[PDB]
Design an enzyme around this catalytic site. Structure first.
Site, mmCIF file in Angstrom:
data_model
loop_
_atom_site.group_PDB
_atom_site.id
_atom_site.type_symbol
_atom_site.label_atom_id
_atom_site.label_comp_id
_atom_site.label_asym_id
_atom_site.label_seq_id
_atom_site.Cartn_x
_atom_site.Cartn_y
_atom_site.Cartn_z
ATOM 1 C CD1 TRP A 69 -2.541 -31.487 21.538
ATOM 2 C CD2 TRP A 69 -0.818 -32.206 22.649
ATOM 3 N NE1 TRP A 69 -2.405 -30.748 22.818
ATOM 4 C CE2 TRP A 69 -1.490 -31.244 23.398
ATOM 5 C CE3 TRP A 69 0.296 -32.937 23.174
ATOM 6 C CZ2 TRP A 69 -0.990 -31.038 24.502
ATOM 7 C CZ3 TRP A 69 0.801 -32.695 24.331
ATOM 8 C CH2 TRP A 69 0.237 -31.353 25.094
ATOM 9 C CB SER A 92 -0.020 -38.985 18.120
ATOM 10 O OG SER A 92 0.093 -39.054 19.475
ATOM 11 C CG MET A 93 -4.282 -35.574 18.099
ATOM 12 S SD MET A 93 -5.126 -34.271 19.191
ATOM 13 C CE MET A 93 -6.802 -34.528 18.818
ATOM 14 C CG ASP A 111 5.363 -43.462 21.340
ATOM 15 O OD1 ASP A 111 5.405 -42.348 22.257
ATOM 16 O OD2 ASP A 111 4.720 -43.253 20.207
ATOM 17 C CG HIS A 148 5.106 -39.803 20.171
ATOM 18 N ND1 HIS A 148 4.093 -40.784 19.869
ATOM 19 C CD2 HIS A 148 4.364 -38.653 20.253
ATOM 20 C CE1 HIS A 148 2.895 -40.224 19.680
ATOM 21 N NE2 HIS A 148 2.907 -38.980 19.811
HETATM 22 CL CL LIG Z 1 -1.243 -36.645 20.104
#
Ligand SMILES: [Cl-]
Ligand SMILES: [Cl-]
Ligand SMILES: [Cl-]
Ligand code: NA
Ligand code: NA
Lengths: 277, 277, 276
Positions: free
Chosen positions: B32, B98-99, B228, B257
């Site tokens: 995201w 990530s997501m 991160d 990240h």
């Molecule tokens: Cl994310």
């Protein structure tokens, strides 16, 4: 999620639209030279208040086709007609921002109110912006119009940079949106048709909607800023209100041209009051 | 290059994807609020190594449709399933950043492992990112979550500008990407659905994948940075590794990240050493 | 208006725009931009009574972004399919920078039945590579490798810098606004990273010298005298020398992107040549 509205040299002209939520339809019609994405601050308020929100990108703008012709209100209005017909919309509220007020004016005049319950003129160009010998009352003279045209012709991208700074400025106040938000809008206008961007100037400045406002006999709201540098209230919203019986006015204090973003809370409160009524 | 994966208000939902090279399929699932273009540094290394590389844009993001609903993991995983089904992908590796780790977790849980060879959780949100007294080993508490939602609601474009700065920063180090590259990523996020952008925050922060990770009986890699800020290793990857006993960890020193861009070689090496037999 | 020309499982599509009515003028953009680079040419051409077709090269603008085909055999095949699909006749092909490669290879490979005239604008022929054996080129191995490693390692930063030089004529770095430059940067930023890379080898190392021997049609070279990327002396000059009866319009103070900085002169040269 494109409507075909015609062809040019046998290639389909397609209109990009978004259709969100459930409820009576509110169709949001953006100004020059932006796109449906300019309604960011309205869409969630409207959906949460129980409406179905449709935005679309005028031909030449946003994600829609970029034809060479058709950049006048008869065609713009036919494009809106095809959208309403194809989505089979009833009890619609048309919300026209700036030049989008022209589609509203002309839609009622040309296609009548079978599908339309209410309308909103938001920072909008009617009744007739041109100032001239025949229409000495208007706001924009030839000289002023030529500056826009020559900017788009000579360096559109630099002209758009300047235009977008002013769009969200109220007088001295130039902090109503972030720089990121400004750049975002600049980039939406950057991608538009250079031809459509030019032709629109003539369309929005020199089209006379006075005859059209006469056929208005449904509930009507004017939302407008008192500090709108592009489309001054006294020459536009004020006169549209005076042309249309039983119309309401919400004059937003310190509102610039792009007041739907700068004064979202106030814009939406006026819009939502008007819709639930 | 689109897949139709659903319909809402009478219009298809389309997912944009790219499919490059020949060999074992590796599906790269972005975080995201970016798009498949975030994999710029991985695709060529994977293709060269003899893999077929599929990227797609999550609904609401990049070049995919921007509907109103479906921004939760049941739908996101269903969209992934349709992509696998439509492209008839067999013997797949799923890489979730990530997501996108959420689609990895939920796919295996819901659809099983029959199409799937290996999986990779890269800077990924599982097992369960919500942090509370009863679940202290999450990463994001209520207040933090509300700061995300508030930012997106009130000035998404400015919020994204700041978010993209932190995305690639490893503690005090913010020279890990160029400004051009950061701004590129900003612009990708700017074009996303505002609603999708918002709902995703609830999806990735409040979805519990712990039950899903229990089903992981295929080789699993966790790639994660030790720096991160957004999804700290200790409250995500470290716990995913513990949840999945077979799993290998590649903890990248100085990794932020966005470490697939800042530490591409180290990222790609971990991925390639894992992908091989 | 715009449309797609069909050219793993999914077809490759070329985005093009087709404006006006009249004899066709097909504008072929340079790297790593798109059809939108012709902003200053479209109106003047249509106003003069031509139909103007622009298209986005595979990997660029609004066209598909495949993994392969980033060489002139395929680039010229794509151009051929477009002209065939549109059934164009009496075409003037206008090739800017690397787009002169499609022009050279199209005439050489497919011949001239659909083509009336050609224009090489700031174009890469006859052979841009500069080496020991071929000193008449512009771009040496060290320069070529700088482009490649820049694109592989930080393409977005490389592009930002490239776009600054594109519109600069020596010390005149005010020829376009930052807004316009940044607009062009963004057009490039969205292109295929793979196409962006492979084009470097295609435009720098493809030898069009035997292609130019097949040119027996009216030909205009338009070029700046201050083009940092594709110097006149190593390109347009030589293309002119290669082609009999060819005309030159050397624009004083013109940088690489002279169609934007010097629209007025670029357009004057073009229109004079089109009606002759
Ligand atoms: Cl994310
Ligand atoms: Cl307007
Ligand atoms: Cl080039
Ligand atoms: Na864009
Ligand atoms: Na397996």
């Amino acid at each position: 999620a494109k409507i075909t509205v015609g062809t040019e040299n046998q290639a389909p002209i397609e209109i990009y639209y978004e259709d969100h939520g459930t409820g009576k339809p509110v169709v949001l019609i953006h100004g020059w030279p932006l796109s449906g994405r300019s309604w960011e601050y309205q869409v969630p308020a409207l959906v949460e208040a129980g409406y179905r929100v449709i935005t679309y990108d005028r031909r030449g703008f946003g994600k829609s086709s970029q034809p060479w012709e058709g950049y006048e209100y008869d065609t713009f209005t036919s494009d809106l007609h095809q959208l309403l017909e194809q989505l089979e919309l009833q009890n619609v509220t048309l919300v026209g921002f700036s030049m989008g007020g022209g589609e509203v004016a002309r839609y009622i005049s040309t296609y009548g109110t079978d599908r339309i319950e209410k309308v909103v003129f938001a920072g909008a160009v009617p009744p007739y912006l041109y100032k001239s010998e025949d229409h000495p009352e208007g706001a924009l003279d030839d000289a002023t119009i030529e500056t826009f045209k020559s900017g788009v012709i000579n360096d559109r991208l630099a002209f758009l940079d300047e235009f977008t700074k002013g769009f969200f400025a109220a007088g001295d106040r130039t902090d109503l949106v972030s720089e990121s938000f400004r750049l975002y809008n600049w980039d939406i206008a950057a991608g538009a048709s250079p031809k459509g961007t030019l032709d629109c100037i003539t369309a929005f400045s020199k089209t006379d909607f006075r005859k059209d406002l006469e056929k208005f006999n449904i509930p009507t709201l004017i939302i407008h800023g008192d500090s709108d540098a592009t489309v001054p209230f006294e020459y536009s919203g004020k006169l549209t209100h005076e042309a249309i019986p039983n119309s309401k006015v919400a004059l937003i204090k310190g509102g610039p041209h792009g007041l739907n973003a700068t004064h979202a809370k106030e814009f939406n409160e006026a819009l939502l009051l008007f819709l639930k009524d």
